[PDB]
Ligand binder design. Structure first.
Ligand code: CA
Ligand code: CA
Ligand code: CL
Ligand code: CL
Ligand code: NA
Ligand code: NA
Ligand code: NA
Ligand code: NA
Lengths: 121, 121
């Protein structure tokens, strides 16, 4: 099973994602803000990381930039309310492997998680 | 009259702000994205600058950081949908003189424009 971290402060959305991921073959840990996410990412191995764009302590893009500075190169998917092409490009340049605008498709998110897991062996 | 630039890509909100400002004694120029705002700020003198948090080409915080790097110290008010205290603090540390969460009060915005104009003689 892919091992994935999901970081969002919206507990309903986080629970929804976790339920759908574990329905499929994806073992999922939830972090409810950027501080907990940073800690978990630095003390556990994940195959893919799914990060919401806005949470307490560290927003998603800021956490991603910290990770890439730390030479943590785990595949990252950003979930963001900033839906312009310019903001998608900024998220990708910041080091994300994909960038899904909200409202997002859970089916697409699961497929992209699996694609990234397959690519990173 | 205070001379003020208002930057937002939402034309209805920009027009509303301009109407209320000019009703009061505030001469107002509108810029509809961050590129036009940057150009106008570098080619005109303004007493106060009101910047929306998200627009094409340059978001409000990024424009503010560019301005403060350029040693342009004109008072800036940020209008933002990011309403947590943490995000307000980040906006202030980025160089803004005030930070109003949306939905904002036009009456408060006018009063704060006038306070900043009075303080900068
Ligand atoms: Ca969130
Ligand atoms: Ca806007
Ligand atoms: Cl956007
Ligand atoms: Cl917020
Ligand atoms: Na499981
Ligand atoms: Na932040
Ligand atoms: Na006028
Ligand atoms: Na930006």
């Amino acid at each position: 099973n892919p091992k994935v971290l999901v970081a969002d402060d919206d507990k309903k959305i986080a629970q929804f994602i976790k339920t759908k991921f574990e329905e499929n073959g994806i073992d999922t840990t939830v972090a409810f803000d950027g501080k907990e996410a940073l800690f978990l990412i630095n003390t556990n191995n994940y195959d893919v990381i799914v990060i919401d764009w806005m949470m307490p302590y560290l927003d998603g893009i800021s956490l991603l930039k910290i990770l890439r500075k730390q030479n943590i190169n785990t595949p990252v998917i950003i979930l963001s309310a900033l839906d312009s092409t310019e903001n998608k490009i900024e998220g990708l340049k910041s080091g994300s492997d994909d960038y899904l605008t909200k409202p997002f498709s859970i089916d697409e998110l699961i497929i992209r998680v699996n694609i990234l897991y397959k690519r990173t062996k």
